[model samples]
Target chain A: PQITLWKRPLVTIKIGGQLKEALLDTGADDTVIEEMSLPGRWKPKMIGGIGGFIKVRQYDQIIIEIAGHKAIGTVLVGPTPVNIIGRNLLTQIGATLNF
Target chain B: PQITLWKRPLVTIKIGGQLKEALLDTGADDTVIEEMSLPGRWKPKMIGGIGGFIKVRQYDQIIIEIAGHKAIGTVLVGPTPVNIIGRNLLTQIGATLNF
Candidate 1:
């Protein structure tokens, strides 16, 4: 499937049985979600971005579906301005940039 | 041309006769660069990201070549942690996301 890059390349994703819209951030190394609740225990971690670093709860083995492509990986929940689907999940879905 | 999404989709870009690496940010609406000397007058603007918003100098009719593809558009210069190639420049090069 091909998705055109609009003003903001946003896509619908399902995580922990909840639907959400996330920005497809190729600049981010890891996926970061707006503060959310999950059933599993998580470890505390920090992620850095263009702005700065922020603390997050890193949960492993989380199942996320992006545009109907199911992927299982680590998901970080934090006080992010927006939910970001980074390369971690993008690779699982075989996402690439083409011109 | 197709570029695979990695930990960071960093690409070499030539802007203002200088070569630099910029992150391909689908999350950003406009292209931003670290403070640099450009030949044209610019307007003052602000852009918000994950952490916060920052002031920038918006330059119009700038020519930027990304990964061998030439893109001419607005390029904002400011105190950015990293250079970002947003949808504005990406679209000019016909970049799309595929899975």
Candidate 2:
């Protein structure tokens, strides 16, 4: 599928059986979601962004569906200003940047 | 041209005859640069991002070269934490988000 970079490249994603909007942020290294409840055990970690760093719960082997593409990876649940789908999932979906 | 969205999608850009690294931020609406002395008159404006709103100088007719693609558009200069190339300039380069 082709997605235009017209505005903030926001896409709908389904995680843990819930649908949510997330920004497709290529500038971010990892996927960050708003603090949420998940079924598995997670490790406490910290991730940095433009403004600062925040504590997060790193849950591995999480399944996320973005635009019908399914990807399994680590998801960080925390107090992120915005939900971001980063390289971790982008790579799994074979996402490419082109002109 | 094809660019990889790996590890923060940082690309080399030429602005005001200087080479600098900028993040290809699909999540940002307008391109932003750290405080710089760019040639031309600019209008004072404010933009809101994840953290909060900040004052910026909106310079029109500014030329920026990203990955050999020349884009002329509004470039905002302010006290940004990082230099970001947003959709305003991305559209000029015919960039797309694909998977």
Candidate 3:
């Protein structure tokens, strides 16, 4: 699927048996979602964003379906404006940027 | 051009007649660059990120060549982790996300 950025390129994702919208953010190094609870033990971690660093709960081996493509990786739960599917998961889903 | 996520999608951009690399940020609503001076008057504005917000100088009608694609729009100059060419400029370059 080719997604044009007329608006924010948000895609539906299935995570923790819940359907939610997330952005395919090529610029983000790690995936960050709005604060949520997930199954399993998580470690506290800090990540750098455009303006500053954020403290988050890192859950590993979490499975997510982005636009129907599945990926399992680390998911950071924190306070963010939007849910971003970053390069870490983008690579797993074989996502690409095209012009 | 189709770019894979095997690496961060840092593209060369021509701004202020200086060539610099920037990330193609799908999650960012506005384009932001690490502090730099540009011609003309700009309004000081605030932008939000993962953790917090940052006040920046917004320069409008700024011409930037992203991977050789010319685009003119508002470019925010601020203290950012990296320069990001966001949806505002990405749309001008006909950039898309594909899987």
Candidate 4:
């Protein structure tokens, strides 16, 4: 699939058996999701962006279904305004930026 | 060009008689560059991200050469650490996310 930038690259995702929408953010280095419950152990960590940094629970080896494609990576749970599928997970699905 | 996520998707750009590297940030709604002087009339604007919002100088109809591709859009000058080629300008270059 070739996603145009005319609109936000928002897509449906399935994680922890729950459905949610996330942005395919090429800008972000790590995947950040809203607070949620997952059956695993996580450690407190900080993620930074253009604005600043925020504390998040880092959960590794998480399985996420993005746009029907299976992707596994480290997912950070925090208080982000929007859920982002960053480079970490995007690379798992062989996503690329093309022109 | 098909840019894989193996590395940060940074590209060289020419704007305001300066050359710099910028990230092609799909998650960013607007283009933000490091403090630079752009010609013509401009106004103040605000943009937010993972941490908070920052005020910037918004220059309209700014012409930029991104990886040799001509992109014309509104470019914001601010104190951001990274220069981001956001959706506003990425769209003009027909940049798309593909898998």
**Number of the top-ranking candidate, with lDDT as the measure:** 4
User: Model 4, residue B68: displacement in angstroms?
Assistant: 0.6
Candidates' TM-scores? 0.94, 0.88, 0.96, 0.98
Candidates' lDDT values, in order? 0.88, 0.85, 0.90, 0.92
Error of 3 at A13 (Å): 1.0
Candidate 2, after superposition: displacement of residue B71 in Å? Answer: 1.0
Query: What are the clashing pairs of model 3?
Result: none
Worst 10 residues of 3 chain A by lDDT: A47-56
Model 1, which residues run further than 4 Å from truth? none
Q: Residues A1-99, candidate 2, lDDT per residue (tens digit)?
A: 888987678889999989999998776778989988999799999775544466899999999998888999999998776799988889889888888
Poorest stretch of ten by lDDT in candidate 1 chain A: A1-10
Predicted candidate 4 versus true structure: per-residue lDDT over A25-88, tens digit per residue: 9988899999999867899999887578889999999999999999988999999889999999
> What is the full ranking by DockQ, best candidate first?
4, 3, 1, 2
lDDT of 3 by residue, B1-99 (tens): 988998889999999888999999888889998888788899999998886789999999999999999999999999887899999999999998888
Considering only the true interface residues, what is the Cα RMSD of candidate 3 after superposition? 1.0
TM-score of 1: 0.94
Provide the global lDDT of candidate 1 against the true structure: 0.88
Tell me what TM-score chain A of model 3 achieves: 0.96
Worst 10 residues of 4 chain A by lDDT: A46-55
Candidate 4 per-residue lDDT, tens place, B1-99, comes to: 889887789999999989999999999899999998777899998888898778899998998999999988899999999999999999999999997
* Rank list by lDDT: 4, 3, 1, 2
